[PDB]
Amino acid sequence: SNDMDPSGYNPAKNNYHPVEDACWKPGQKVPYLAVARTFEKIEEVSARLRMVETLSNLLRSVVALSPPDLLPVLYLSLNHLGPPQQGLELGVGDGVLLKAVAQATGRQLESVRAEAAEKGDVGLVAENSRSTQRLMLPPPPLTASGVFSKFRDIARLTGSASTAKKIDIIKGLFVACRHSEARFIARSLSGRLRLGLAEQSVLAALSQAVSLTPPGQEFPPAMVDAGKGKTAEARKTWLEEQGMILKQTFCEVPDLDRIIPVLLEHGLERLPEHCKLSPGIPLKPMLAHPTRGISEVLKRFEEAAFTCEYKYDGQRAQIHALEGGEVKIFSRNQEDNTGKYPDIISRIPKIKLPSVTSFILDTEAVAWDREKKQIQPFQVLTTRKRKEVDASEIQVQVCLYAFDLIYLNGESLVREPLSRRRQLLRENFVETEGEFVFATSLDTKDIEQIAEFLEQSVKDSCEGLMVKTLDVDATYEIAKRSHNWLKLKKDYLDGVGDTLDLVVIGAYLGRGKRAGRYGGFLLASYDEDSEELQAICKLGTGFSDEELEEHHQSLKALVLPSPRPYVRIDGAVIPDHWLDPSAVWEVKCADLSLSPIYPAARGLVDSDKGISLRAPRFIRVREDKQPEQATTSAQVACLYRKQS
C-alpha cells in the first residue's frame, strides 16, 4: 500500500498523480499535515497560477480518495468556519492564542508576546517554542476533518470560563502537532495564514480539480486527468469555462455547504441546475473601483452611458423578501443582520406594490434624524445594538436608500442591465420620505453637471458619487467583474480633503509581509498650549515597500527605551519602539472623529474625548518641518468643527 509519510507530501511536483502521489490511502481521513505541506508549497511561490495548480493537486487527491473531506479541506484553505450567514466565530484572537502558546510551553505570556512581535508571526513562535505538555501516550496524527471539527468546537464554547476551555482544545492540538502543523494551526487561529491564496484562487483550484478528476466514479477512477486528451489551448479554454460556471454559481450562492454536496453528486457541468440565486441566501455584492477624478471616470466609461448617484455614508443592507412573507437582511460580507433591523422588517409592506411576491434589494442603511429629517453621520449608525427584539426601543432610526434590484417575483435580474434593473426598482417599489427612498441620481455626461452634482452630494451629507454604466457591461454578474462600479469620493481628488502634518512618536513591528520591519506608526499633533505631543492616530498604509524600508532604517536611529515626558498617548496602543519626536509626515484622511482613546485636542471640542482620523494614509515626509511645525491640536479641533 501507499505508505508515504505526509512529511514528504509534495503537491507541487510535476506530473502529480492524485492516487499515487497522495500521502494517504483510499478511505483514509486526509491528514492535516497533507494540508500543511500544501500550504508550505503555496507560500513558497508568488504566481497565483502556480498556487492554484498546487492546491488543485491536493483537491484531486481528496476527491479521488476521501470525498467526505473536501468540505473541511476547503474551509481550512479559506480559514473560515462555515457559511458567513451562520455567524460562527472562534472567539480567539492573538490574545487567547498567545495565552495558549504560553501555557503549552510554560513561558510567561509577555515573553511569548515579545517574540511573536519580533518575528511578526505567531506560527513561528508556536513552531519554534518548546512544548511542556508531558503526555504518557503519543497522540495520533491530526486529520483535516479532526482539526476543522476542533475549530468549530472552539467556536461553540460560550459563557464564563469558556476562554480556558477554548485554550484546552488549542493545547490539545499543539501537543498532537508534527513538523509544520503547529505553524499553520496557530496561523489559522490568528487569522493570518499568509498563503497568498484566497477565495478566488480556491474556487479556481476547485473547478480545476473536479474538472480534471471528476467526482463520483467507481474506485479507482478511470478518469483521473480529463485534460490529457485535449490540446493545451483547448484545455485552457475548457478549464476557464468550467471555472466560470463555478464562480458565477458561487457568487449567487456563496455557500460551500450547499455547493460541494451537489458538486460531488452531479458534477460541475450540472451545477447551475441544482444551485441558483434564491431569496434567503445572501449573494456576493457588486463592489466599486476607486477613481481619482471626473476625467478618469469618462476615460473608464468612454461611450458607455452612465448614471451618477449619491454615495451615502451608511452600511450596506441586502434585503431579502422570500415568497411566503419572511424577510432577511444581510451585510456586505453576507452576515445575517436580520435581528439588527426589526424596524426595517416591519417596514417592508410599505415599500412594495401588491404584485411584489419576492425580491432582493441592494440598499444603504443610513442613520436618520426623524425630528430634523436629516441624515446622521455613520458614527451614529454604529451605536445601534446588534440584536434588537423590540423596534420600540430603537434610538437611532434608519432610512433605506435603495440603489439596485437583483431579484423580483421569482426571477433573477443578475443578467439584466442596470437601466432595466433600476426601472423595475422604480416601477414596483414605493418611496416614503425618511424611511425608504431611491438614491439621488443624475444621468449625464456633462463634466460641469457631474462636478456640480458631486459638490451637492457632499453638501447633502454623502461621501461623493457612485458612477455606474446603464447598458454596456451594466449587469450584476460578479464573476465577470466584481468591481463594475466607480466610486468618486471627495478625499480622492487632488488638493481636496483633510491633510495634516503629524509627528511620528512610535513604531509597531510589522506582521506577515511587514515582518522584520515597522508595520505601523503612532502619530501625534502638537498641543501648543501645553507644549506636548498628543497621539492622534496610527498609520499603516500609503507608503511603498521602498519608502517603508527607508522609514525603518531611518527611524531605527530614533528608538528610545522610554517615552519622552511631553508625549501623551493615553489609551493608544503602546508602541513597540518609542521614537524620539523628529519625523513629520503629511497624512490625508477622509474625516475626523471623536475618539474614545486618543487624547489629541481633548477639551477643545469635548471635555473627555480627543480626536482621531478616519482612514488615514501616508502621503509624503515633511523633511522641511520639525515637530514644532506639525499640525496643532487647535487646528485639529478647527478642522473637526468645520467638518461638522
Added chain:
DNA sequence: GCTGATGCGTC
C-alpha cells in the same frame, strides 16, 4: 455588579 481587555464586524 462593575470595568477594561479582547474579539469581530462595520466603514
Added chain:
DNA sequence: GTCCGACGACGCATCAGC
C-alpha cells in the same frame, strides 16, 4: 485589472479580573 494581504478608527458583545 485581478487578487491578495499588509494596515486604519470605532462600535457592540463578550468575558476575565476585580
